[PDB]
């Protein structure tokens, strides 16, 4: 099955998922000088006051913090979006060392990690229908750099030892994703895809300009996770990022100058 090794990593995915070589694949390099400032872009509306986290899952490629998406309780709107998108889960991508890990890059710079808050368009009723539509998902992408600790991340870090291996989950209630946001909501946006199989071309990407700072100790705990299941040969969950894909016939727009 697909993964992030020599034998099954991103450069192999096209064999099972031919859309990997499609016209709107993610992630991409954000060339900051080429991105067009678009004064028509609205401020992002992130409304997470009523978010209900339920559970955290090691799915063998990342860990997902899952939310109750049975009502409009944690929603993204505004920005480049028309309508309302409900938060279903967040997860991260990260590296074996601090010099790589992000999926998007900024003028070819790689960050230590990247957070993806995944939301689906309520006009399609459920996530599985949304991913079949070109405007089905909105993913908020946030870069992580290593420096000061992110206090709001620590609850996530300190549950990872309970979900070390693929298929483990743990109760994860009352977690407030507002604690993972940077101060500014300035953003880049472009049309793209999920960055994991099935690589569906259903995403409006919203990538924040300002990274959050996490500590080296926080990121080191991410790197103690395992891709493998319980008892299997240990293969650390590191370098679970897809590299930048061709931009093709797309424009990246900036909300800011």
Binding residues for substrate: 195-196
Q: How far is the CB of 116 from Zn ion (least distance, A)?
A: 4
Q: Is 61 annotated in the active site? A: yes
236 in Cβ contact with 226 (< 8 Å): yes
- Cβ-based nearer residue to Zn ion, 2 or 82: 2
Q: Tell me which stretch binds Zn ion (CB under 5 A): 110-118, 125-133, 160-168, 206-214.
A: 110-118
User: Residues touching Zn ion: how many (CB under 5 A)?
Assistant: 1
Only segment of 6-14, 71-79, 115-123, 164-172 that touches Zn ion (CB under 5 A): 115-123
* Cβ at position 241, least distance to Zn ion in Å: 8
Whether cis (ω within 30° of 0) applies to the bond prior to 198 is: yes
Closer to Zn ion at the Cβ: 116 or 166? 116
Q: How far apart are CA 98 and CA 257, in angstroms?
A: 28
Out of 24, 61, 104, 116, point to the residue binding Zn ion (CB under 5 A): 116
CB of 10 to Zn ion, least distance (A): 13
Strands (E), the chain: 29-30, 36-37, 44-47, 53-58, 63-67, 75-78, 85-94, 105-106, 113-121, 137-146, 169-171, 187-192, 203-208, 212-214, 253-254
Residue linked to tokens 């400032």: 37
Q: Measuring CA to CA, which residue among 172, 146, 29 is closest to residue 90?
A: 172
Query: Judged by CB, which is closer to Zn ion: 116, or 119?
Result: 116
- Nearest residue to 42 (alpha-carbon basis) of 182, 192, 204, 180: 204
Catalytic residue among 7, 12, 61, 119: 61
Question: Which residue has the closest beta carbon to Zn ion?
Answer: 116
Residues 38 and 254: beta-carbon distance below 8 Å:
yes
Query: Which residue positions form the known binding site?
Result: 91, 93, 116, 195-196
Select 128 or 233, whichever has its Cβ closest to Zn ion. Answer: 128
Q: Which residues define the annotated binding site for Zn(2+)?
A: 91, 93, 116
Q: Cα dist. 254→41, 53, 121, 226 in Å?
A: 8, 31, 22, 36
| Window of 15-23, 113-121, 216-224, 239-247 that interacts with Zn ion by CB under 5 A | 113-121
Burial of 155 per CB tally in 10 Å (0-12, 13-18, 19+) = middle
- Indicate whether 119 belongs to the interface with Zn ion (CB under 5 A): no
- Cis check for the bond before 112: say yes or no (omega within 30 of 0): no
Stretch that binds Zn ion, among 108-116, 152-160, 172-180, 200-208 (CB under 5 A): 108-116
- Smallest gap from residue 36 Cβ to Zn ion (A): 25
**Shortest separation between residue 91's beta carbon and Zn ion, angstroms:** 6
Distance CA 203, CA 140 (A): 10
The residue among 77 and 93 lying less far from Zn ion, judged by its C-beta, is 93
- Annotated active-site positions, please? 61
Site residues (vs Zn ion, CB under 5 A): 116
């Amino acid at each position: 099955h697909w993964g992030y090794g020599k034998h099954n990593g991103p450069e192999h995915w096209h064999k099972d998922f031919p859309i990997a070589k499609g016209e709107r694949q993610s992630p991409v390099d954000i060339d900051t000088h080429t991105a067009k400032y678009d004064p028509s872009l609205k401020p992002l509306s992130v409304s997470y006051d009523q978010a209900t986290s339920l559970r955290i899952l090691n799915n063998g490629h990342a860990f997902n913090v899952e939310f109750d998406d049975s009502q409009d309780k944690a929603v993204l709107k505004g920005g480049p979006l028309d309508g309302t998108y409900r938060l279903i889960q967040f997860h991260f991508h990260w590296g074996s060392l601090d010099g790589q890990g992000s999926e998007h890059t900024v003028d070819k710079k790689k960050y230590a990690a990247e957070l993806h808050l995944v939301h689906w368009n309520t006009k399609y009723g459920d996530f599985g229908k949304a991913v079949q539509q070109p405007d089905g998902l909105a993913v908020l992408g946030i870069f992580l750099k290593v420096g000061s600790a992110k206090p709001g991340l620590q609850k996530v870090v300190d549950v990872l030892d309970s979900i070390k291996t693929k298929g483990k989950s743990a109760d994860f209630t009352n977690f407030d994703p507002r604690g993972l946001l940077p101060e500014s909501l300035d953003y880049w946006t472009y049309p793209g895809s999920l960055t994991t199989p099935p690589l569906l071309e259903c995403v409006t990407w919203i990538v924040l300009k300002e990274p959050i700072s996490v500590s080296s100790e926080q990121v080191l705990k991410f790197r103690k996770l395992n891709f493998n299941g319980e008892g299997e040969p240990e293969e650390l969950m590191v370098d679970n990022w897809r590299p930048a894909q061709p931009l093709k016939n797309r424009q990246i727009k900036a909300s800011f100058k």
